[PDB]
Write a protein that binds this ligand. Structure first.
Ligand SMILES: CCCCCCCCCCCCCCCCCC(=O)OC[C@H](COP(=O)([O-])OCC(O)COP(=O)([O-])OC[C@@H](COC(=O)CCCCCCCCCCCCCCCCC)OC(=O)CCCCCCCCCCCCCCCCC)OC(=O)CCCCCCCCCCCCCCCCC
Ligand SMILES: CCCCCCCCCCCCCCCCCC(=O)OC[C@H](COP(=O)([O-])OCC(O)COP(=O)([O-])OC[C@@H](COC(=O)CCCCCCCCCCCCCCCCC)OC(=O)CCCCCCCCCCCCCCCCC)OC(=O)CCCCCCCCCCCCCCCCC
Ligand SMILES: CCCCCCCCCCCCCCCCCC(=O)OC[C@H](COP(=O)([O-])OCC(O)COP(=O)([O-])OC[C@@H](COC(=O)CCCCCCCCCCCCCCCCC)OC(=O)CCCCCCCCCCCCCCCCC)OC(=O)CCCCCCCCCCCCCCCCC
Ligand SMILES: CCCCCCCCCCCCCCCCCC(=O)OC[C@H](COP(=O)([O-])OCC(O)COP(=O)([O-])OC[C@@H](COC(=O)CCCCCCCCCCCCCCCCC)OC(=O)CCCCCCCCCCCCCCCCC)OC(=O)CCCCCCCCCCCCCCCCC
Ligand code: HEA
Ligand code: HEA
Ligand SMILES: CCCCCCCC/C=C\CCCCCCCC(=O)OC[C@H](COP(=O)(O)OCCN)OC(=O)CCCCCCCCCCCCCCC
Ligand SMILES: CCCCCCCCCCCCCCCC(=O)O
Ligand SMILES: [Cu+2]
Ligand SMILES: [Cu+2]
Lengths: 185, 139, 75, 67, 145, 552
């Protein structure tokens, strides 16, 4: 029975809704850029492309690690699943820490949320994505803990798969945000 | 799953047409140029429909006909064993109470209440996720 | 004492019955207290509405229960 | 203007309309059948009513009467 | 009508699936609702206290009335523990029949009392009132055993 | 021989039968009942707010209210009526009758179902708990426009609670939509194809897609507004395009919303008409295609709420709205062609459906008139708009909801509502509504804008306000027969020992017991058309049904 997977359908449609949420955020950002004429990144702001690219590379690497974990999960092997998902969790935590460090260095040199119109849209566009990353990390921890406490079944496999493409959605959203904020300007 | 994919593909086509038409017609003939809000909204609505329709198309392209997708199917064709459907549970109301606590702590700016609500949300979601997987107690 | 096992399954395992006169008199005295709380230094009248409404609801509930038990519709 | 007039209308027209429509409708006849009179013959089908209460053919007695 | 009368149909199981027209009822009892409710309450709370089913029959007994009554009692769910009261308002006959398990529990000194109450109430034309009175007195008579 | 029944069914149920089941239940039928009850309670509180508004609006001058109090009153009335009654009553009806209509035993995610219900309830409570604040509830409009909602203007704590309650409720609604989509996609009987399912199911699927499109962008806008109000975040600053940004976002959410609260009720009346006309539904595929067309077009007209700002491209949105006006007319003609040449009997659901037809027709005429920008230039933000959307909203939501209750009360309880009380209720509601909301067209055409707490005697409009208040009090006294009928008929009332108490029923819900069992079915009939219960209960009609299915 169960020719298509039901948790998969649910996760896909919910990911679509979250795409609409990020649509709202992108609209907020794209407006008020057309109002800043000239040096539209204002008085004190300078983005650090020497630190923005490594964290993106780590995020893509984590996506690849998660896909490898999915491959390990499709065959009834739980230990490879665990290894690859621990690696993915660590890479994601490193991304989050790098983003926080960039936040600190950017806030102690000017740009703040109540300081300018650019700081507000920048911080809201990136912080909600960071929150989604933290949610994905929590999901990873819960999935691993659940694998520890019962026999490995196709339901466990399905859980791994749906968590994986949630992570992939987060990664593609970050790619869009990065391309929009650091290159297009 | 042909009709679901076809529905979402029709929606995608119409949304993409409307998006591109609105984009170019605000690039011209508008008081300030591109509108930059409705354009983004329509583009990412098209993206929503595209994601869902593409997933459904990929599922349908590698699946045998189901008893509910085939007329002249018999009710004894679906005989078997369906999935697992949860009986009674009390975790949803606790999840809702935790989320409401965090929401009240955000409405009235109280970071201690926000943190308590977040911790309660984590705890109750853990309880919901582990409910049918805890083993017997090890004594 | 005892109630029916068809109303309280574990009636033989613990205290399961409380007489209805206690509840009726308690409700009436609660309403009386709510009413008597209109004596003091409470200038303004937005709270008298709450007191009167809460007492009226309780009296109506007690009266409904007493009537339906007197006429046999419950019990 | 006409404070008393507006008050009277606002407070009275809904009640009058309610009463009229209630008289028109609630005085009609319901679909419930008429009560059986013991003078006419029993025309309904036979009825058997049980108690359902005790949850889980040799006769042991009897008694008779003729009103 | 014994062949699924115009709306009823046999299903994949042995269950029937009947219908009704948009303005019609499907019970057709020539008694008030608030009298059927009192009879149901009496018939339930007497059986609960007596630990024995109580049943009521209203149709005809156009034969040996005792034989028909004790052939009717065999339709009660648990006939070996049951007390049935049958009334014919055309032949004007009242008959109470028992079971084996309900015997020596106060059944002999309560059946004539039930018949007497039912008759005394039927001599004015109160069928439901007579039934309720008879059920009350017989239920107060029988004891749980 | 004989068969042993009870003199009367059991009235209520044993002690302790509901309270713990109510906290731990995962049964979609009980969840739908809870939806319905809580939604009607919120309807009552919103109606009380409207009654206060009417009684102040009569008799020029401020008699007992204040300006701030009147503002809070219309804000909270609009908010409660639009988001705490209609949007959750949609999912109440869905949870009631969708798995039965597709032949399923249960919904896809039964714990997510309960989570959606509880999120709705607690979000509504959070949003409404602003009246106990010394500043009062929210006092900007229901639309909460751009610079008025910042922290300098409207600095009270009611707006914060408003925002957070809306966010909680929106998450609940999104989860409900996900559940419904997945249920229709996966759980489905082994003979029911997608072009054999009911129009109510089709409309619910479309409404769920619209929900998934519309609600997340409102959540994003609310989070941006909270960021402003609590951190000084320059996002809706008028030095930017912050004034028009908020309007664009909010109306992109808000028009799909008014289409979210219409299509399930179109589906309800399209399920009700054929049963009481003893005919098939006219143009099954045409109705499906009209629903899809409305769903598609509803996401490109949002700016017809922004004609007077002087910042939108008028012809695009005007053409889109004129276009969206056509599938509704096709749907109306299908509903009429269903009743044409039948055997019509008018019980309470059919009566309420005809009232719906009339009222919605007039409201839609007003709307398509309102869709012209030159005319909107005069009649916008007046009582003409109020009259229009009250006609459409009342006609669809209130009338189709009452029709659905009168229709499906037996299928959920095993009892019948009284019909004389239903006729009294219908006529009270009809007279009251057409007395209170007809003169407002004139009221708004002559200069009288919306959201005014007071006016002057030297103006006109002092008799029409009194007439509208009289009608409003009639509408207020209309609810007592309905409430009394439900309260009595739940416990007493004619029992239903059959399937289909309204004979000639379709849609596979009338082919199971009157109160359905847990998992809803003990047997399923062969599925060949969209009328399986009809083909099951009248087997001699299949030949006559297929022979003449195309004459017209
Ligand atoms: C600011 C500092 C100043 C002061 C600081 C104070 C210092 C605090 C230090 C105290 C040390 C904390 C440790 C407490 C007990 C340790 C438990 C343990 O290690 O055994 C695992 C234990 C195994 O239990 P078991 O006896 O072997 O068998 C039980 C059955 O098998 C299970 O069957 P079951 O069906 O009965 O399930 C029971 C229940 C899980 O068991 C429980 O009952 C947990 C609730 C206990 C407290 C309830 C009190 C009332 C709640 C309000 O299931 C759930 O409900 C799932 C909830 C998951 C909770 C995880 C959330 C993590 C964040 C917590 C914050 O499982 C747990 O309880 C998980 C505990 C959380 C993991 C440790 C994380 C703590 C790290 C500290 C963070 C900083
Ligand atoms: C002439 C023929 C007539 C024809 C008949 C037609 C039938 C009806 C037509 C009548 C027309 C009138 C209709 C007008 C409106 C009806 C009003 C109404 O709806 O009432 C509810 C009415 C009640 O039904 P019912 O037939 O009376 O129920 C039978 C009794 O429950 C059976 O149980 P019980 O009554 O035997 O139980 C006794 C209960 C009686 O109450 C009830 O039965 C239910 C009501 C209780 C709810 C609230 C409890 C008290 C809260 C007070 C705060 C107020 C604020 O008392 C209590 O236990 C309550 C707790 C009291 C605590 C006392 C503490 C004892 C220790 C004291 C030690 C010393 C310490 C010192 C101080 C303490 C002071 C006391 O129906 C319902 O709506 C609920 C019933 C089904 C539940 C559905 C879910 C409800 C959804 C809500 C929406
Ligand atoms: C298409 C289909 C249409 C669907 C329906 C359409 C709806 C139309 C609109 C409604 C118009 C009027 C409605 C009148 C209802 C008539 C009542 C009736 O006779 O039906 C009996 C009928 C029979 O129930 P049963 O389970 O068979 O037997 C009950 C047992 O007798 C005994 O059960 P138990 O012992 O387990 O406890 C049950 C308890 C239930 O108690 C509670 O629910 C606690 C909260 C109630 C008061 C909270 C106020 C604050 O009942 C009582 O407490 C009796 C006193 C209640 C006084 C209420 C005061 C009203 C003013 O009740 C139902 O089945 C209705 C089920 C759904 C109703 C409850 C929905 C509530 C959802 C969540 C509530 C939580 C909110 C949190 C805030 C509150 C703070 C705590
Ligand atoms: C934003 C709002 C977030 C909404 C939450 C996401 C909803 C997406 C649901 C899609 C499919 C529905 C479903 O499968 O129901 C499963 C289940 C419902 O149980 P059921 O109805 O009995 O169905 C049983 C299935 O047959 C069989 O289900 P299963 O037992 O096989 O479980 C499948 C899978 C469930 O499938 C998934 O949902 C995978 C997607 C991962 C979600 C991660 C998003 C985190 C949000 C970012 C923060 C912004 O569960 C897992 O394997 C582990 C997932 C752990 C959830 C982590 C959520 C943590 C939230 C706290 C974030 C705070 C940190 C920042 C501060 O729902 C959940 O597991 C998640 C509940 C979340 C409650 C909302 C939180 C407020
Ligand atoms: C269920 C709710 C609902 C529904 C169904 C509708 C349906 C429609 N609405 Fe309405 N509308 C609202 C609720 C609704 N509306 C609300 C709540 C507001 C304002 C909220 C706020 O501002 O507070 C609003 C505001 C609103 C405005 C802006 C008014 C203003 O702010 O000034 C406009 C104008 O473009 C409009 C137009 C329409 C049109 C064209 C339809 C069409 O769907 C109607 C089509 C109906 C018909 C019956 C046509 C069918 C066709 C035929 C029958 C053939 C004949 C055709 C012609 C006559 C040419 N609506
Ligand atoms: C579906 C949604 C909905 C519904 C059903 C209603 C129902 C009613 N509305 Fe409302 N209305 C709106 C949605 C709705 N409205 C919206 C969106 C606005 C614009 C919002 C904005 O301005 O911000 C609006 C604005 C609005 C105004 C303009 C206020 C202002 O701008 O000045 C007026 C006044 O004439 C009005 C009147 C009514 C009346 C008389 C009813 C009647 O149908 C209701 C009468 C019903 C009852 C009276 C209930 C019965 C009450 C009791 C019996 C009390 C007993 C109950 C308990 C004890 C708790 N409405
Ligand atoms: C809404 C969420 C918005 C953004 C989320 C991403 C966070 C992005 C983090 C960026 C921080 C920054 O760089 O902003 C520097 C500023 C300059 O402050 P200052 O004047 O110079 O000094 C004086 C300081 N008082 O400080 C700050 O406002 C601190 C920022 C506040 C932290 C964000 C709040 C999180 C709340 C989570 C909401 C959960 C609610 C759930 C309920 C449904
Ligand atoms: C249940 C919550 C809403 C209740 C109805 C609205 C409450 C707001 C106040 C309305 C009446 C105001 C009367 C002021 C009189 C002074 O004194
Ligand atoms: Cu609109
Ligand atoms: Cu305006």
């Amino acid at each position: 029975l169960n020719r298509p997977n039901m948790v998969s359908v649910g996760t896909i449609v919910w990911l679509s809704s979250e795409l609409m949420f990020f649509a709202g955020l992108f609209a907020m950002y794209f407006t008020a850029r057309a109002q800043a004429g000239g040096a539209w990144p204002p008085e004190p702001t300078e983005l650090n492309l020497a630190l923005a690219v490594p964290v993106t590379l780590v995020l893509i690497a984590s996506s690849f690690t998660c896909q490898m974990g999915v491959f390990a999960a499709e065959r009834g092997d739980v230990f490879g699943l665990r290894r690859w998902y621990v690696i993915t969790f660590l890479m994601g935590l490193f991304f989050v820490l790098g983003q926080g460090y960039e936040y600190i260095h950017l806030v102690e040199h000017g740009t703040t949320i109540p300081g300018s119109a650019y700081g507000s849209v920048f911080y809201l566009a990136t912080g909600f994505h960071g929150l989604h990353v933290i949610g994905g990390l929590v999901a990873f921890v819960l999935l691993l803990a659940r694998t520890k406490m019962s026999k490995f079944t196709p339901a466990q496999a399905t859980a791994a798969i749906v968590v994986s493409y949630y992570w992939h959605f987060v990664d593609i959203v970050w790619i869009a945000l990065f391309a929009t904020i650091y290159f297009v300007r | 799953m042909h009709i679901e994919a076809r529905l979402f593909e029709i929606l995608t086509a119409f949304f993409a047409l409307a998006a591109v038409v609105y984009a170019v017609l605000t690039a011209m003939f508008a008081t300030g140029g591109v509108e930059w809000a409705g354009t983004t909204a329509l583009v990412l609505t098209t993206g929503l429909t595209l994601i869902t329709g593409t997933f459904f198309r990929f599922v349908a392209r590698r699946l045998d006909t189901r008893p509910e997708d085939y007329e002249d199917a018999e009710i004894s064709d679906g005989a078997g064993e369906l999935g697992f459907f949860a009986p009674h549970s009390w975790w949803p109301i606790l999840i809702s109470l935790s989320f409401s606590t965090a929401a009240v702590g955000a409405a009235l700016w109280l970071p201690w209440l926000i943190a308590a609500g977040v911790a309660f949300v984590i705890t109750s979601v853990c309880g919901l996720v582990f409910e049918y997987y805890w083993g017997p107690e090890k004594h | 004492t005892g109630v029916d096992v068809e109303d309280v399954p574990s009636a033989e395992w613990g205290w399961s019955h409380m007489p209805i006169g206690v509840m009726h008199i308690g409700g009436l005295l609660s309403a009386a207290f709510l009413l008597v709380m209109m004596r003091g230094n409470h200038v303004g009248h937005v709270e008298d509405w709450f007191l009167i409404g809460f007492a009226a609801v309780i009296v109506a509930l007690v009266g409904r229960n007493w009537w339906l038990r007197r006429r046999g519709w419950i019990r | 203007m006409s404070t008393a007039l507006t008050h009277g209308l606002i407070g009275g027209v809904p009640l009058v309309l309610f009463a009229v429509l209630a008289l028109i409708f609630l005085t009609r006849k319901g679909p419930h059948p008429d009560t059986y009179k013991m003078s006419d013959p029993w025309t309904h089908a036979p009825i058997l009513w049980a108690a359902e209460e005790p949850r889980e053919v040799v006769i042991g007695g009897g008694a008779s009467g003729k009103w | 009508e014994l062949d699924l009368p115009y709306g009823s149909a046999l299903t994949s199981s042995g269950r029937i699936s009947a219908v009704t027209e948009p303005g019609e009822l499907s019970v057709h009892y020539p008694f008030p609702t608030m009298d059927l409710v009192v009879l149901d309450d009496a018939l339930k709370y007497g059986s609960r206290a007596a630990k024995a089913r109580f049943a009521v029959y209203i149709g005809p007994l156009g034969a040996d009335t005792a034989a028909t009554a004790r052939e009717i009692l065999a339709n009660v769910p648990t006939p070996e523990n049951a007390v049935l009261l049958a009334v014919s308002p055309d032949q004007r006959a009242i008959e109470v029949v028992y079971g084996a398990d309900v015997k020596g529990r106060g059944i002999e000194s309560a059946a004539p009392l039930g018949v007497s109450a039912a008759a005394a109430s039927f001599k004015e034309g109160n069928l439901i009132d007579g039934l309720i009175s008879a059920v009350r007195v017989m239920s107060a008579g029988v004891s749980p055993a | 021989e004989l068969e042993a029944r009870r003199p009367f069914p059991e009235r209520m149920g044993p002690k302790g039968n509901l309270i713990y089941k109510l906290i731990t239940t995962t049964d979609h039928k009980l969840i739908g009942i809870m939806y319905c009850v809580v939604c009607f309670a919120f309807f009552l509180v919103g109606g009380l707010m409207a009654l206060f508004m009417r009684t102040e609006l009569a008799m020029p001058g401020l008699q007992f209210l204040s300006n701030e109090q009147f503002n809070q009153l219309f804000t909270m009335h609009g908010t409660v009526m639009l988001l705490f009654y209609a949007t959750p009553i949609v999912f109440g009806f869905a949870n009631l009758v969708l798995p039965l209509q597709i032949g399923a035993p249960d919904v896809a995610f039964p714990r997510l179902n309960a989570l959606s219900f509880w999120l709705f309830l607690f979000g509504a409570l959070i949003a409404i708990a602003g009246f106990i604040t010394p500043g009062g509830a929210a006092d900007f409009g229901w639309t909460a426009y751009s610079p008025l909602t910042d922290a300098i203007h409207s600095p009270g704590a009611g707006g914060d609670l408003w925002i957070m309650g809306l966010a909680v409720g929106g998450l609940g609604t999104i989860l409900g939509g996900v559940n419904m989509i997945t249920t229709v996609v996966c759980m489905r009987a082994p003979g029911m194809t997608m072009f054999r399912m009911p129009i109510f199911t089709w409309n619910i699927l479309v409404t769920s897609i619209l929900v998934l499109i519309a609600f997340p962008i409102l959540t994003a806008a609310l989070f941006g507004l909270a960021a402003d109000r609590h951190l000084g975040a320059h996002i809706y600053d008028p030095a930017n395009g912050g004034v028009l940004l908020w309007q664009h976002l909010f109306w992109f959410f808000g028009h799909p919303e008014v289409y979210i609260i219409a299509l399930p009720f179109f589906g309800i009346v399209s399920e009700i008409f054929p049963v009481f006309s003893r005919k098939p539904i006219f143009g099954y595929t045409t109705l499906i295609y009209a629903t899809l067309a409305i769903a598609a077009l509803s996401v490109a007209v949002w700016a017809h709420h922004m004609y007077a700002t002087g910042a939108v491209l008028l012809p695009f949105f005007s053409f889109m709205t004129f276009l969206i006006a056509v599938p509704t007319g096709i749907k109306f003609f299908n509903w009429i062609g269903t009743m044409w040449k039948g055997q019509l009997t008018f019980e309470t659901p059919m009566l309420f459906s005809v009232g719906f037809l009339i009222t919605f027709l007039l409201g839609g005429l007003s709307g398509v008139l309102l869709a012209s920008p030159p005319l909107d230039f005069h009649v916008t933000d007046s009582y003409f708009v109020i009259a229009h959307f009250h006609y459409v909203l009342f006609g669809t939501i209130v009338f189709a909801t009452y029709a659905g209750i009168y229709f499906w009360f037996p299928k959920m309880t095993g009892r019948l509502l009284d019909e004389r009380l239903g006729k009294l209720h219908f006529w009270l509601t009809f007279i009251g509504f057409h007395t209170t909301f007809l003169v407002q067209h004139w009221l708004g055409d002559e200069g009288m804008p919306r959201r005014y707490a007071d006016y002057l005697p030297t103006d006109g409009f002092t008799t029409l306000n009194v007439i509208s208040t009289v009608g409003a009090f009639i509408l207020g006294v209309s609810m007592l027969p309905f409430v009394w009928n439900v309260f009595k008929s739940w416990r007493y009332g004619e029992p239903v020992t059959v399937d289909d108490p309204w004979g000639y029923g379709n849609s596979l819900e009338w082919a199971t017991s009157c109160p359905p069992p847990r998992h809803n079915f003990t047997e399923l009939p062969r599925i060949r058309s969209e009328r399986p219960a009809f083909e099951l209960h009248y087997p001699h009609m299949v030949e006559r049904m297929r022979a003449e299915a195309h004459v017209g």
